[PDB]
């Protein structure tokens, strides 16, 4: 129940404002900046502000804060969803999200803001559907918005019917300083770029554990996805009935399903780091990386970030494989490895100086995060079984998909 | 299939060596298609096994079945899920339609001795589907 959706800037200036109900005065935006400054300076800053009887709930963008003022007991989740949809629409329409496009795309920005939400209730949020009625370079609105299928425009025709899938894995490990992993969860991400002719009804089928148990084949390798979040095109009723994933893919790249299940296996990359930091004399970084993944998979672009001292200077790196560079901007040692074959072991011996004068305040111990990305390796073991592409006209589709294994929240707690 | 013919003798020898009663990860061949075994493919595989021998009358074992499924997946890209048998006790029919192989008693269904037996009626009659309509959807 937002009252006025406005876009701020880094200096407190409102780049663009669009009131939807008019119950909140436009002058309340000026007090948002002082309120945010006071909250940040006292540790009480939150995404949802409160200027008397008006609440300023907004998120932080790349360069401006999309604060949406409200007065009644409006749904905070609804406001956040509307802000996320607006950000996604802006990203789809404008390649950059900064002040350079706010002051240059006002003619289309105002129209998009007016069409997106009326009276504080959003009605259209699909960038592909919205691009057929609001352009910066007007016909009647498309029937897709009025029709039930609001995520697949009818009449799309292509020379070929090729759909590219992307089974991107997210290996997140929360390893404590004692050496044990506390939060070790892998979140799947099935992103597909559907490019076909017409409005095909995709019938996604994988080796799900529940599906295998229902069919009676609960004995082979099945992915045990604890949480499965289907897209808007995916029919919730069909999935709830008999695990049938039937939905119409959209035109372009979109996220169909987002699996999320816990992982009880050993980490793909094991980092054994030591800190022989002398008392204002020197420091030693005996960091050893052990690859627990399969030898057939190579972790391309392996970047194990080792947090070095903030005031360290004149550092020396004695490693074995991969270039080690210290970035003063980040205040950490970037153990960058181009190719990391499975089962490899890289040993590094850091050595940096330290000023004689002790620091005035503590700096903390940021966790060590690895950036391993091993392609063609599915940690969860989930493999796509079938993709039922059915069209009324009748055509031979050529579906494709690739499995990518990367590191998500794979941080290692320091000592 | 020259590759299938070559792998049939080695697969049969490995199955015979394994008695009737280390590396982590799931590598995937780049560009190798992966899909469930088809009824026609299952029928062709059953016919080839019957002609070459080594599968009809062999003692059914978990290790031998797993080795055969792995070899079939390596040589054809078929998922190792179509080589399922109906629950016992008694004669177990193939779960996938078109399979000509079935398990029959040779003497709790788990302790019963079972052996692979060729059955051409399996490729035409859905014995597994009829026995377990719920499992077939």
């Amino acid at each position: 129940s937002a009252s006025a959706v406005y876009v701020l800037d880094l200096k407190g200036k409102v780049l663009i404002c669009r009131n939807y109900r008019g119950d909140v005065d436009m002058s309340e935006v000026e007090h948002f900046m002082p309120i945010l400054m006071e909250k940040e300076e006292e540790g009480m800053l939150s995404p949802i502000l409160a200027h008397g009887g008006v609440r300023f709930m907004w998120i932080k963008h790349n360069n401006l804060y999309l604060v949406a003022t409200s007065k009644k007991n409006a749904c905070v989740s609804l406001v956040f969803s509307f802000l996320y949809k607006v950000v996604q629409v802006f990203s789809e329409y404008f390649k950059e999200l900064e002040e350079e496009s706010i002051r240059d795309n006002f003619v289309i920005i105002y129209e998009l803001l007016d069409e997106l939400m009326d009276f504080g209730y959003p009605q259209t949020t699909d960038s592909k559907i919205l691009q057929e009625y609001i352009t910066q370079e007007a016909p009647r609105p498309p029937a897709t918005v009025t029709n039930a299928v609001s995520w697949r425009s009818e009449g799309i025709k292509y020379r070929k019917n090729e759909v590219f899938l992307d089974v991107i894995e997210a290996v997140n490990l929360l390893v404590s300083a004692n050496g044990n992993v506390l939060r070790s969860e892998i979140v799947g991400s099935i992103k597909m770029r559907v490019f076909l002719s017409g409005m095909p009804e995709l019938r996604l089928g994988l080796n799900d554990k529940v599906l295998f148990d229902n069919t009676g084949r609960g004995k082979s390798k099945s992915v045990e996805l604890e949480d499965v979040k289907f897209h808007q095109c995916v029919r919730l009723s069909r999935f709830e009935n008999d695990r049938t994933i039937s939905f119409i893919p959209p035109d372009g790249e979109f996220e169909l399903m987002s699996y999320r299940l816990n992982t009880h296996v050993k980490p793909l990359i094991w980092i054994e780091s030591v800190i022989e930091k002398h008392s204002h004399s020197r420091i030693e970084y005996m960091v050893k990386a052990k690859s627990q993944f399969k030898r057939r998979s190579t972790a391309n672009n392996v970047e194990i970030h080792i947090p070095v001292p903030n005031d360290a200077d004149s550092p020396k790196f004695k490693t074995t494989v991969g270039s080690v560079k210290w970035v003063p901007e980040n205040s950490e040692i970037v153990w960058s490895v181009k190719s990391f074959p499975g089962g490899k072991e890289y040993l590094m011996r850091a050595h940096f100086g330290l000023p004689s004068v002790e620091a005035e305040d503590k700096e903390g111990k940021p966790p060590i995060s690895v950036k391993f990305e091993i392609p063609y390796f599915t940690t969860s073991g989930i493999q796509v079984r079938y993709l039922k592409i059915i069209e009324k006209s009748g055509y031979q589709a050529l579906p494709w998909v690739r499995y990518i294994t990367q590191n998500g929240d794979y941080q290692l707690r320091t000592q | 299939s020259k590759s299938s013919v070559i792998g049939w003798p080695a697969v049969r020898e490995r199955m015979r060596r394994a008695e009737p009663a280390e590396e982590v990860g799931f590598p995937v061949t780049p560009q190798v298609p992966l899909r469930p075994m088809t009824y026609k493919a299952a029928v062709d595989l059953s016919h080839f096994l019957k002609e070459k021998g080594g599968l009809e009358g062999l003692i059914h074992s978990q290790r031998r079945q797993d080795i055969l499924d792995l070899w079939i997946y390596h040589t054809q890209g078929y998922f190792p899920d179509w080589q399922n048998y109906t629950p016992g006790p008694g004669v177990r029919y193939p779960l996938t339609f078109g399979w000509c192989y079935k398990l029959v008693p040779v003497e709790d269904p788990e302790r019963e001795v079972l052996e692979w037996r060729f059955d051409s009626r399996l490729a035409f009659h859905h014995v597994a589907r009829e026995l377990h309509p719920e499992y077939f959807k």
């Binding site: 392609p375 993709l387 690739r402 499995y403 | 469930p36 088809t38």
Partner: peptide
């Protein structure tokens, strides 16, 4: 070629489940 694993063709349905 493509970084992150080469794209592989997908099947149409569970042919082994009828």
């Amino acid at each position: 070629d493509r970084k992150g694993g080469s794209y592989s063709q997908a099947a149409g349905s569970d042919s082994a489940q009828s």
